[PDB]
Design a binder for this molecule. Sequence first.
Ligand SMILES: CCCc1ccc(-c2ccc(S(=O)(=O)CCO)cc2)cc1[C@H]1C[C@H]1c1ccccn1
Length: 226
Amino acid sequence: THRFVQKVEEMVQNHMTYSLQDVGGDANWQLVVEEGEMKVYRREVEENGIVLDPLKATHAVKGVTGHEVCNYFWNVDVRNDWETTIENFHVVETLADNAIIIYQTHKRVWPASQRDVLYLSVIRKIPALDPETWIVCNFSVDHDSAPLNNRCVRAKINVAMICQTLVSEISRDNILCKITYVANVNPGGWAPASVLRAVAKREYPKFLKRFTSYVQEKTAGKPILF
Ligand SMILES: CCCc1ccc(-c2ccc(S(=O)(=O)CCO)cc2)cc1[C@H]1C[C@H]1c1ccccn1
């Protein structure tokens, strides 16, 4: 029990309720990029001239479990192995064995100002109660030990990586991880709409391919962690 436990539970339950829903039959979501089972959608949303476009993607990744996908997404010690858009990050606070608060700065995308972010990152298993599900939620929080960074505008995020595992002695050949990934990012102040939209459209599919291939590579030949 840390001070965020109730907020974590609300965020995780909202994602389980609303984020997991299939959007294939929902014309409100625009399917923007498809590469096999990887499907990336957005809604075009602006608030006060600032792009907020919600992002939602699904993927089906052979040979890894939801638990493993979530561990590698959450574990800061492997972060620099797959992340390509981060300049710096610092763990600000350790709340629990499954929850931390992170500060990070993103590489600048000309001509917009650099952004930074301050967020809680939590990894949770949700029992079947139906598949079991593993979820990582990353969502912005306020913290006193946030640095002064005069180069950066503070973005706010609510991201979840939600994973369900299907299985046919069990082999990697017989396992598939189904991922739903959602990201709602407020860039904080102004940035050109065309730039934000092009960064999203490029960087989200690149991340999902890169990150899922990395998990496949790191786990192959290791005992399966369900
Ligand atoms: C001007 C920057 C806006 C901007 C700030 C931040 C983020 C962002 C933050 C966190 C996460 S994550 O999945 O929680 C993994 C931990 O980092 C992904 C994305 C995305 C954008 C928008 C631009 C989109 C984007 C997508 C992917 C990578 C970088 N940028």
